[PDB]
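Exercise (ungraded).
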Amino acid sequence: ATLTADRTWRLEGLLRGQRGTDGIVGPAPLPAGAAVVAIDTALVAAGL
Amino acid sequence: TIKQTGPRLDSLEVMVSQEGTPLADISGRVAVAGTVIWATKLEEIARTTSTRVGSGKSSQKVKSTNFDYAASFAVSLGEGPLNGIGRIFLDGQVRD
Amino acid sequence: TSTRVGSGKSSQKVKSTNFDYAASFAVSLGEGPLNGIGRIFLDGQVRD
Amino acid sequence: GFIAAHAEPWPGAMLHSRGSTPEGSFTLAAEADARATIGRTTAALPPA
């Protein structure tokens, strides 16, 4: 990812199709605004 | 002949937050705890930590983050030029 | 309060117990009527 | 179900409680350490 601004980072060399990453995209191209979240410890998936 | 009874002096020295006390200004080789001076506040990386209940509630409560209060403790032993700093430790003779 | 060692020992040892010795500490600030209570904290000037 | 939380300058645990009821009888299901790293897309991209 290349910093273009203090908050803005330009993701480059995007890789798609891993575990069907491309599968969602082929029907619908990514929208102008979306929430992009890095994988992290804070992310919580358990308890369901 | 006029005499001063020997004081406890350096033994059992503890760092003191208050700045009213004058600095030691040692003229020989003494070990001084000193008084904390200009601590740079504290670094509160994680104020509190939590315990996971696993399946019953949440297994994500536990935190591995570093403890708080990392700071620059600029303890000043004494005023004036000094040399021969060695053998220093909070709880013991020295740290590696 | 204790924690489990899982498979190697017992996996049921975990406990979430809180600290004990909760008491009605009543601290007398002195005899006689008093007013203007403010700025009270155990470890600092105040709590939220 | 992943729930990373973007805390707004908040220091402390984030409690995520899930309650099926609309009114809000939530039962704690998750806890988040701090604001997670999150990003907002400013661009629309065709599938790579």
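Further reading is listed at the end of the chapter. For now, observe: Chain B touches chain C at residues 51, 53-54 (CB under 8 Å). The two ends of chain B are 48 Å apart (CA to CA).
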